[PDB]
Amino acid sequence: QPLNKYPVVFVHGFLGLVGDNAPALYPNYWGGNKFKVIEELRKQGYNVHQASVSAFGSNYDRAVQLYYYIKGGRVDYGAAHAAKYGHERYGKTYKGIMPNWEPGKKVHLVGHSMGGQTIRLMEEFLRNGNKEEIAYHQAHGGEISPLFTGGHNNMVASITTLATPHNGSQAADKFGNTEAVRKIMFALNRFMGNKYSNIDLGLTQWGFKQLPNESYIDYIKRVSKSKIWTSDDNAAYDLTLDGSAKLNNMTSMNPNITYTTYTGVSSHTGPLGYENPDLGTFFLMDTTSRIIGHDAREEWRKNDGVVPVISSLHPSNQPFVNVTNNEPATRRGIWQVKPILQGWDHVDFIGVDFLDFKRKGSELANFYIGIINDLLSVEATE
Amino acid sequence: QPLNKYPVVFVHGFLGLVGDNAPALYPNYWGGNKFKVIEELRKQGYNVHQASVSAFGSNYDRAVQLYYYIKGGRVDYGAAHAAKYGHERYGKTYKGIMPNWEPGKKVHLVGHSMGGQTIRLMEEFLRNGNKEEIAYHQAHGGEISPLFTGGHNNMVASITTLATPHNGSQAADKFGNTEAVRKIMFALNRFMGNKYSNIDLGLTQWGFKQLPNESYIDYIKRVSKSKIWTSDDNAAYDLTLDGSAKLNNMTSMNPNITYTTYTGVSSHTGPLGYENPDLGTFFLMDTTSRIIGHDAREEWRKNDGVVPVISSLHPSNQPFVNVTNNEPATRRGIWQVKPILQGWDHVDFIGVDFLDFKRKGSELANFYIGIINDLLSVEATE
Ligand SMILES: OC1(c2ccc(Cl)c(C(F)(F)F)c2)CCN(CCCC(c2ccc(F)cc2)c2ccc(F)cc2)CC1
Ligand SMILES: OC1(c2ccc(Cl)c(C(F)(F)F)c2)CCN(CCCC(c2ccc(F)cc2)c2ccc(F)cc2)CC1
Ligand SMILES: CCCCCCCCCCC(=O)O
Ligand SMILES: CCCCCCCCCCC(=O)O
Ligand SMILES: CCCCCCCC(=O)O
Ligand SMILES: CCCCCCCC(=O)O
Ligand SMILES: CCCCCCCC(=O)O
Ligand SMILES: CCCCCCC(=O)O
Ligand SMILES: CCCCCC(=O)O
Ligand SMILES: CCCCCC(=O)O
Ligand SMILES: [Ca+2]
Ligand SMILES: [Ca+2]
Ligand SMILES: [Cl-]
Ligand SMILES: [Cl-]
Ligand SMILES: [Cl-]
Ligand SMILES: [Cl-]
Ligand SMILES: [Zn+2]
Numbered sequence A, B: 001q002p003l004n005k006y007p008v009v010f011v012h013g014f015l016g017l018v019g020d021n022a023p024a025l026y027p028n029y030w031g032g033n034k035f036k037v038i039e040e041l042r043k044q045g046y047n048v049h050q051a052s053v054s055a056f057g058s059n060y061d062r063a064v065q066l067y068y069y070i071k072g073g074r075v076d077y078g079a080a081h082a083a084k085y086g087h088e089r090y091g092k093t094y095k096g097i098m099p100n101w102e103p104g105k106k107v108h109l110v111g112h113s114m115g116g117q118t119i120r121l122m123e124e125f126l127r128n129g130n131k132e133e134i135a136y137h138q139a140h141g142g143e144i145s146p147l148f149t150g151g152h153n154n155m156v157a158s159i160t161t162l163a164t165p166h167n168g169s170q171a172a173d174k175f176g177n178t179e180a181v182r183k184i185m186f187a188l189n190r191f192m193g194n195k196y197s198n199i200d201l202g203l204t205q206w207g208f209k210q211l212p213n214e215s216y217i218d219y220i221k222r223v224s225k226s227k228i229w230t231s232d233d234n235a236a237y238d239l240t241l242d243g244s245a246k247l248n249n250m251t252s253m254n255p256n257i258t259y260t261t262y263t264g265v266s267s268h269t270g271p272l273g274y275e276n277p278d279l280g281t282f283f284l285m286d287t288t289s290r291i292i293g294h295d296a297r298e299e300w301r302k303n304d305g306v307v308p309v310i311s312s313l314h315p316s317n318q319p320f321v322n323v324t325n326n327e328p329a330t331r332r333g334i335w336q337v338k339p340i341l342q343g344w345d346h347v348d349f350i351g352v353d354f355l356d357f358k359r360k361g362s363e364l365a366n367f368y369i370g371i372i373n374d375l376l377s378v379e380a381t382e
């Protein structure tokens, strides 16, 4: 019935809120008003979905959530993970977009920004499991999530990433992951865990959910004891250069998966060889673009607002091949890096820059239809 | 003590809120963060002031308020005016920036946008009075505001306008002054008349101030009978082509006043000869710029976001002379039209476009120093 035999799952990045988990007035993550990715692709008869996973959590936490988003069930972050980092083992429970998901029934994964990292880690778990969980269930017994077992292959057809910081970003290193702004992010999460809140910012496993009969002062006190304040099991850490490198060092190429990347630049070279944001860079990335663009290492300067070009092309120590925009992108086992999109900033990929008239809806529709056609190709060359 | 002999009064336009009358978080009208016109000019030893007058009111109402802002005392809109339009005769009372203002003690007036119209009308009243008020106090006796008497000359040295819609704007005609959006404006003013409100949006003379012991429902009921809902004694009407024409038809050149105008362009000609806003046009003017730029009459298309160039150069029926940037702007009695600032939109003149990095503080400082210099010149060529 659907033109695509494998469902496509779109996976948002850091700070991403989608569907019913957004504020009353909020941009629509996948396409803004420029091209309503989910609705429009569906009207054209494609089977597509937008995952909802932790906005502020680690790639680990998100990757677990992604699995349960697709498969359905109670999120299980793993007993060893929970014990090591100091957060609940069990999380939200998901209906499941594909309850029969198993070897043989594949899914296409496309990720924006951090979503690309999240996708890689989930596949890692499927294929290779999680060593610390395997080891913990070996020593202490009990039940272990199948997600952490390994040996589950032939479940993801493609991994396609848009402006993903495969190699991290200095914006995290020098801003996002600093003490003062982590405190802000966590305070936000605390607040939005209050008992009148309808949005889940993705750190409730750390205890940021006020109980219905608990005072806010008692909430604050309970939650000041959480390890979140000092942990590295969070998005801000994972987007640093170190944090991303760690994911790179523990991931590996699946020879059956079609891997493809897209990258945007929205900076321009200035007097001294530093990079500054283009007029038309969504203004919220003004400061981060300048931090990146003024890097000591020259090859780390060009950026889409928050992720350097080097970081988005491909994970740095994984195999890649520079590809053309016209040629079929059909190679398995290798990062097919599409040609840099000139003038696209980080958020132009998802169409929410309503300030930028150069980036039009028809363009964005072509981009997404572009990706679907590549995915159709992958299906046809099996 | 002050380098300028005559105080300079800056007069904000439509929707302008200044000083103690702005919300908690709000751009500073005169210079934004780019150049703090009042503070900086003062530091350089100039005597300058920012008037506070009705943000939503007619040019008439604002013009009266301007007078009392400068002179001090209880705003008197005039008995005939009040009776004809159906609003209170008396308004707020002002401390007075210049209590001794009289023929011989002059003041420089610079107006942004509608502020330019307001300034013209005030001077008209000083010089020629108000015929309706003269006639009404003739017939019915009582006291009459000196503002409406006429014969007060030699009180304003200069009238300088920035992006003033002397000939009105289609944005008013086809948006601002339509039924539905006038209702929205008036509802806003109603709401901000509530008993907890600390901002005056300028229509309280129409009854939009909830009494301390009145219910909101009774407030709504009382105020639904106001003529404001159907009146032309409001800003939206006055910024229309007709509305501005009427001011033009009742104003005339004072041969002792130095008149000077500035105009911005922030549109570009498209495929078919229509004008579209430049990237860099403050986004809130996106829709108005397109309305203006798609006008049938070609010469009405080029615009700064909300004011067409034809409208800002000079009142259409008054004398003008195209001037150069270097030409001392020292002629009395004629509209000295300064050369168009390319890429300045309506709000770049006041520096509140924080999105536009092309328009820097040092540029805006030069523009304002420029104006002061011209004013110093006027003083010295007496
Ligand atoms: O700062 C960001 C970032 C990204 C990656 C890294 Cl690595 C880092 C970090 F930490 F390293 F610095 C930071 C996160 C989000 N930023 C602003 C959010 C945009 C927002 C939006 C977009 C899509 C939506 F569905 C909803 C809202 C929005 C707001 C208002 C609006 F008028 C339009 C759009 C942009 C980038
Ligand atoms: O709509 C405007 C208009 C002007 C003339 C005519 Cl003729 C017409 C009409 F009739 F056609 F409708 C309309 C009035 C104000 N508009 C937007 C408000 C700007 C705002 C601002 C400006 C100055 C301040 F001191 C403080 C805030 C602001 C908001 C948020 C922000 F991040 C920065 C600035 C722009 C033009
Ligand atoms: C007549 C009482 C209701 C007014 C409508 C809403 C005003 C908000 C209350 C302001 C405040 O308590 O700070
Ligand atoms: C503040 C007076 C002019 C605003 C009219 C345009 C605002 C509605 C369009 C939506 C948006 O601002 O992104
Ligand atoms: C991040 C902004 C959240 C939207 C706040 C306004 C909601 C409303 O007035 O209904
Ligand atoms: C269309 C009316 C303006 C308010 C909604 C836009 C704010 C947002 O981008 O979330
Ligand atoms: C709406 C209130 C948000 C709380 C801000 C606290 C920030 C901090 O403690 O660093
Ligand atoms: C019009 C915008 C003003 C919002 C101010 C809210 C606040 O004080 O936090
Ligand atoms: C630019 C919009 C004006 C809102 C001012 C107020 O709500 O008091
Ligand atoms: C937070 C970004 C600006 C809000 C968009 C608007 O005022 O229409
Ligand atoms: Ca952009
Ligand atoms: Ca501008
Ligand atoms: Cl939020
Ligand atoms: Cl499974
Ligand atoms: Cl929640
Ligand atoms: Cl009030
Ligand atoms: Zn975790």
Ligand SMILES: [Zn+2]
Pocket (backbone or CB within 6 Å): B058, B060, B061, B077, B081, B085, B087, B233
């Ligand atoms: Zn009036």
